[model samples]
Target chain A: IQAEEWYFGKITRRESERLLLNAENPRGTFLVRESETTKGAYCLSVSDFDNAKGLNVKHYKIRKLDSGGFYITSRTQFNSLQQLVAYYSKHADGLCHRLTTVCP
Target chain B: IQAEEWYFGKITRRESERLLLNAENPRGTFLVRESETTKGAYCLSVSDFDNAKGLNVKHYKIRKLDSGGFYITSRTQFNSLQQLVAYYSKHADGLCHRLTTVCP
Candidate 1:
């Protein structure tokens, strides 16, 4: 069976975590696969995690999952790693993992 | 214990249903307490149907729910009831009930 699809956006660290945790009903069961940060963009894959890979450097084709809810990724644009990390840390409880590295 | 909170938006009938059904985690258990439509404004209260009344002519105070998600209502401005009903019926699977009489 195919997986669902979701949208992506740039959000503050707190906003991102809030969306992850409180936005949906069944929380925590969702997974984030293939999260990456670049010079001005951040990407993440939301699904079962078992079906996909973890943050990798690859042009992943957007795959259609199932007839149910789809998946999407969201991120925020920041000037510095410190700013990003601080925002992310404040809302880290909802996130699957900590910020990996800042992009140049 | 208090209920969770959620946001409302002006969505097409189909869009409204989709948001109600697919946007969150656990589905079906949620309920809409009160809903009303005026000239071009619509308001609703979302919570356990048992705690609040349904579609009443009263000024309801927005109550704070528990430490989880909050609730908000959404509606669309339509020129005619036929148009509104058409859109709503198309996405009715996600809605809790049918559209009531349209307002002037």
Candidate 2:
């Protein structure tokens, strides 16, 4: 599977958490992975710390557009995953947290 | 009050419908007007046709941000009203209908 600095293709939701919840990563660190359950879909996993879970990873489905765009919310669609990352990096949009850093 | 082509300052919701629901205008024609009930806020009113009502208008609140930006949804903020108009013109986002033409 192909991968990028923030993309881990075919990784299960569990493995996404393992990489994101590392001691070095802080809140808002995130990575994109292929959805295990859904074909032709992607998952965005981010590490966020809260009192209830203390350390938690939030996952959201990255919906695909018929025009080959990507979006977390139906309102805003990006031409590429890189564009989606750039957008969420700047604005929280509908995400639980704004993407801060790529998993290291 | 200063007004632009698409902005009808201090026009009541009733007046908005009068202008937008003109027989010449089609669905998605919209205008921005100052909110009568809320100080320092704007309302977006658009004309739409539906089976039940035949002719209808939908209104949305254009919220102001502490940073002096404007947004209908907290997810996306624009620096100017024109910018918001342009964004919604391209994408429906959360609006009931995509903004087609400024009230004519």
Candidate 3:
């Protein structure tokens, strides 16, 4: 049986990178806007030592829907891993999205 | 003033929790030995979470005197930062140092 919402999809960088690179009117990355974006919010760019603090390979930057700004962590608190997957399915704005999209 | 070897020391938890609650003549806990156990071998145990899978809080555990066992991280290569604070100041043994010696 199919539900009202679906979640999950393995990360394949090529597609993610392609989605971010397209139009975005012309600027914002994430060649595409999909479930992976939710997953991306929870991801940190290892190369960008500024936000991640280097040693954190699993950090995720979650923009609280009700709080104030960003919430960072190597793990997420989204009901199911896909909830994070579903949440990002809502918007396309930020750097992690593009970073995770292109990271190998 | 003098110095044979030393680094920084900021975390002062009731004297390292009174050096692990008084005694080896008892069990295995640091009641006071030295150098924050090289900053507690990189320090993870964010309440365990089976090796900190619970969102993490700056993970660290480096048990490699020279290639081997327990090298997890929120971060660490140990060139400084006390040399991991001086490699646990040279040994005292595991369990996130009695849970960071009476965490508060």
Candidate 4:
């Protein structure tokens, strides 16, 4: 629902936060796709993207956690995932955190 | 006088270590330039390049530390820093370490 403010600074190739904010798929649950298995299926850290093949992923919405932290549920939907990725890839400030709890 | 076999992996956009190896500048003292001052002046890590403006810099030779580490002095020289950067910019594995000491 609401993702807190997290900054990745210039850790990514994309840093045009100003434009990404007004881009399409404004907000949705971010989804990460990888071959391996881990505690957090979706990687929120842009720096860690290079760890795995095809490297890293993102979702649309940042869901709220009842306990304390936040997660991105798979139930989220978007018209186009490609463009959505492009948008988030730019302004990934608040979206830099890891979604250890994926939409599995 | 010799750099270790360090690795930055896919940290940078350039990951063509093969070509960079045969490319210009077989080996030289690695140099790094930044606006402010600090510990190591030259960035051996491709990851740290994004930290400073125009990003980090590299030199020809990576001076071996007397104690146990390494350093890059001003004496080192290269033909073209541009193409040289393009070379190491590829396979930055052995060049991932920082030259805490600079050529200044």
Candidate 5:
């Protein structure tokens, strides 16, 4: 699957320089979400931080469509991971933008 | 190290919704890099997409400093992974920004 072929990495100074020098031509773009809370906490619950303070955590949802297009979704937390619970929700489309393209 | 506490995820619709509703309060932020090429390809060489068709791939470099501050770095490709090779490089500081803040 396309997802399996995907690779993720943590940011570093060296890596950043490399990216800046080569931003023009990307193989593909992947989605990212960064937050403090753990997966279990962020997904299962909603808490005050979701609004009050911006320290809950961020979540990411990246999808590579069958047509070879990809999108990234980011989720952030409410407060500390402690003030949260799981709940169902929906996100809008067009929220994700293209990070890369294919050339003929 | 703080890095170990970091988590990475592939984008999905459900994950997106949870994040949108809870972006205000993030506990912490983790940096992310997603690209089609393998880690082996993007880092080692300089290629065309770094300025061309934009299909090489995008990379991310995130850092959480000792002071509890964090930054994210995004790297894109020049062309397909095959057209690249590894080399030494340097990235700019201030590229990575914060995703969350702590309260008193």
Candidate 6:
């Protein structure tokens, strides 16, 4: 299924982080937010916890290629954010954790 | 590190499958084998056992692009098999299992 619900457009990075790190959102929960630095770009934030570090959230830059394809890494590109989320949902790839549940 | 040791050159698919299914090789263990159909193509075979399936090996074709890049999927490309293995070692991506240890 497409991750349309996961995209929380225009939210600030801090807000996205807060949503992912919330007590309700366990590890693997994630949300997408528009990039602060780049006007048209986006950022994916996910909750990750380490035994030593406790609650943590990881953020990855979702870059847009010249072809208009989106990617967290150059190797993995998607036509839309939904496809990217779907791909990462099936496998973590390079993310700290796979996308499990979207932010509540 | 590079996956030089994981590459088993010029082996048939059946042989590669057998090697991955060997008693010693555990789930996630994998190797790269030359493709029988394509002269320069390669295949990555990994061990994956399910309770219902008993023992199983998953195989993926490593295709070569005109740009001299290698990839299991168009989204992810690498300069060499070592890079591909390294990427998968970090995350399963879409593979049946992440590359844990080379076939031994």
Task: Give the alpha-carbon lDDT of every model.
Answer: 0.30, 0.81, 0.31, 0.31, 0.26, 0.79
Worst 10 residues of 2 chain B by lDDT: B1-10
Proportion of true inter-chain contacts also present in candidate 4: 0.00
**Top candidate by lDDT:** 2
| Model 4's interface RMSD | 15.5
| Model 4, runs deviating above 4 Å | A1-42, A45-71, A77-82, A87-104, B1-31, B34-41, B45-69, B72-104
Judged by TM-score, which candidate is best?
A: 2
Give residue B103's lDDT in candidate 4 (0 to 100): 22
**lDDT tens per residue, model 2, A1-104:** 26578988876554576677666887889999887555788988988887765666778888888988998887788999999999999998887889998998
Candidate 6: stretches off by over 4 Å: A1-104, B1-3
- Model 1 stretches with alpha carbons more than 4 Å out: A1-4, A22-37, A45-104, B1-104
True contacts kept of each: 0.00, 0.00, 0.00, 0.00, 0.00, 0.00
lDDT at A38 for candidate 5?
32
Docking class of 2: incorrect
Clashes of each: 27, 0, 20, 27, 62, 1
Q: Candidate 3's residue-wise lDDT over A1-104, tens digit each?
A: 02312211343222332222332222221221222234334332222222233211112334444443334343334544334443443532333332333222
TM-score of 6: 0.47
Query: Per-residue lDDT tens digits of candidate 5, residues A1-104?
Result: 22322222332222222332233533222222222233311111111122233222223333334554333323433232121111112322222222232211
The DockQ value obtained for model 1 is: 0.01
Candidate 5's C-alpha runs over 4 A off are A1-104, B1-3, B9-22, B26-28, B31-34, B37-92, B99-104
Would you list the clashing residue pairs of candidate 2? none
Note the residue pairs that clash in candidate 6.
Answer: A75-B75
**Predicted candidate 1 versus true structure: per-residue lDDT over B1-104, tens digit per residue:** 02312223333222233333322323222222222222233333221122243222211222223443222224443443234334543553335533332221
Counting only residues 3 or more apart in sequence or on different chains, how many pairs clash (N, Cα, C under 3 Å) in candidate 1?
27
